């Protein structure tokens, strides 16, 4: 006890990692990455 | 192959399905629209040249003219066309009409053969479906979207209906051909092992087998009505009928029309009447045995460095639900990085089937990326790792059976081994310990042979 600094930001475990819940601005720029090539 | 070998070649599936039909139905099949299909689907020149020989000749010819037509250096290819002669089931060998073993073709098929090549008449230009004089006057790109929607609904049934709620009976139809498997703990059906390869080549040859699936019942369905209706979309576009099919139809013709429209080969107007127009996918059915298309730049490109096989990402709405149906991969934060920790996700799908040739086909032939830009072989050393995962499911076996122990002589146990082998109930034998495994299906028959010997 008596040791609580900072850091502690990564969080990814399990088979269902489903890392798609917070993107804010990402779906709008997905279409722009297709018509350019 | 688990049920797709007969789909790649069209001339082989038609000859196999014709052998198991009714004699009254085959008589009506020998028509003028069917003459241009039994020859165009072929490939060898020997099997196609014999059709013109039975047209000019009016009398049956003996086998002496056939053994001489090969001169001296051609009888080797004659044996290859011997098995095909019995596939179409149209010739007939008589006794001796003018020599010895006279070969003659069915005169019912010979009459309709000249109508679609030389002679003619009137009933050919009166019936619909096979003709239907009508031109096209509708926006073509607007109707191309409906052809893709008919095939997209089938993809929802293979996964488990993620967002579809249609009333089309397509789950049980594909289950008869070994494509869809019913879920035991649940109720939405999934997919079999041979169903993964169908979602890879994307060829219209599979839709031809779906049309003849309802005819396999052989109850109150005829082939003469299906063959004359399937010839509509085989003539590419500009082949309609306006409203001629409405006047000349029945209850049986409407049933096969609704099933063909849901497959993706023909589009029908509202209220299931008025004017019908075939889709664009029907052109590739009469062109070749396969086909490609659907992209102009191919943004996808895999990696040939490590071993987890980074699959392609960012394409369209087709590859989104396609990779998850294979083995359910993973995705990270950016534009859906699929297949990055492939180690346990692949083994989850291989436990329900030996799907080993479909993953390699999807890894090698996905959009032709590496074989065009690079040069060496696409798979590195994963060809051995994939085979190791398939062998992991062979470590055990879940089967039932009975074992016979405690015999007396050694020569007496050898006679009992032939009893279960002939009936087909033997699995494994052991002559060193006198042990034999017998399935419970034939347990009531093996015990009778032991009490008599």
From Swiss-Prot, chain A:
Q: List the disulfide bonds.
A: none
Question: What processing steps or modifications follow its translation?
Answer: Dephosphorylation reactivates the 5'-excision step. Phosphorylation has no effect on transcription or the 3'-5' helicase activity.
Please indicate which superkingdom the organism of origin belongs to.
Answer: Eukaryota
Compartments where located: Nucleus
* Misc: The TFIIH core complex from patient XP11BE (a patient with XP/CS who has a C-terminal splice-site frameshift from residue 741 in this protein) reconstitutes in vitro transcription about 30% less well than wild-type but does not restore NER in vitro or in vivo. The XP11BE TFIIH complex has all the subunits in the same stoichiometry as wild-type. Purified mutant protein has very weak 3'-5' helicase and ATPase activities. In another paper the mutant protein has wild-type 3'-5' helicase activity. The mutation is recessive to wild-type.
Disorder noted = Xeroderma pigmentosum complementation group B: An autosomal recessive pigmentary skin disorder characterized by solar hypersensitivity of the skin, high predisposition for developing cancers on areas exposed to sunlight and, in some cases, neurological abnormalities. The skin develops marked freckling and other pigmentation abnormalities. Some XP-B patients present features of Cockayne syndrome, including cachectic dwarfism, pigmentary retinopathy, ataxia, decreased nerve conduction velocities.
- What family is this? Belongs to the helicase family. RAD25/XPB subfamily.
Its subunit composition reads: Component of the 7-subunit TFIIH core complex composed of XPB/ERCC3, XPD/ERCC2, GTF2H1, GTF2H2, GTF2H3, GTF2H4 and GTF2H5, which is active in NER. The core complex associates with the 3-subunit CDK-activating kinase (CAK) module composed of CCNH/cyclin H, CDK7 and MNAT1 to form the 10-subunit holoenzyme (holo-TFIIH) active in transcription. Interacts with PUF60. Interacts with ATF7IP. Interacts with KAT2A; leading to KAT2A recruitment to promoters and acetylation of histones. (Microbial infection) Interacts with Epstein-Barr virus EBNA2.
| Function description | ATP-dependent 3'-5' DNA helicase/translocase. Binds dsDNA rather than ssDNA, unzipping it in a translocase rather than classical helicase activity. Component of the general transcription and DNA repair factor IIH (TFIIH) core complex. When complexed to CDK-activating kinase (CAK), involved in RNA transcription by RNA polymerase II. The ATPase activity of XPB/ERCC3, but not its helicase activity, is required for DNA opening; it may wrap around the damaged DNA wedging it open, causing localized melting that allows XPD/ERCC2 helicase to anchor.
This one is known as General transcription and DNA repair factor IIH helicase/translocase subunit XPB
Swiss-Prot record, chain B:
Chief site of localization: nucleus
**A GO molecular-function descriptor:** double-stranded DNA binding
Localization of this protein: Nucleus
For biological process, the GO terms are: DNA repair; nucleotide-excision repair; transcription by RNA polymerase II
Which cellular components does GO assign to this protein? Answer: core TFIIH complex portion of holo TFIIH complex; nuclear speck; nucleoplasm; nucleus; transcription factor TFIID complex; transcription factor TFIIH core complex; transcription factor TFIIH holo complex
Highest rank taxon of the organism: Eukaryota
Q: Which Pfam families match?
A: Tfb2, Tfb2_C
Keywords from the UniProt entry:
DNA damage, DNA repair, Nucleus, Transcription, Transcription regulation
Q: What residue ranges are annotated as transmembrane?
A: none
Which cysteines are cross-linked by disulfides?
Answer: none
**PANTHER family under this entry?**
GENERAL TRANSCRIPTION FACTOR IIH SUBUNIT 4, TFIIH, POLYPEPTIDE 4
The entry assigns this protein to a family as follows: Belongs to the TFB2 family.
Annotated function: Component of the general transcription and DNA repair factor IIH (TFIIH) core complex, which is involved in general and transcription-coupled nucleotide excision repair (NER) of damaged DNA and, when complexed to CAK, in RNA transcription by RNA polymerase II. In NER, TFIIH acts by opening DNA around the lesion to allow the excision of the damaged oligonucleotide and its replacement by a new DNA fragment. In transcription, TFIIH has an essential role in transcription initiation. Stimulates the ATPase activity of TFIIH subunit XPB/ERCC3.
Q: What is annotated about its quaternary structure and interactions?
A: Component of the 7-subunit TFIIH core complex composed of XPB/ERCC3, XPD/ERCC2, GTF2H1, GTF2H2, GTF2H3, GTF2H4 and GTF2H5, which is active in NER. The core complex associates with the 3-subunit CDK-activating kinase (CAK) module composed of CCNH/cyclin H, CDK7 and MNAT1 to form the 10-subunit holoenzyme (holo-TFIIH) active in transcription.
**Domain comment text?**
The C-terminus (residues 305-462) stimulates the ATPase activity of XPB/ERCC3.
Q: What is this protein called?
A: General transcription factor IIH subunit 4
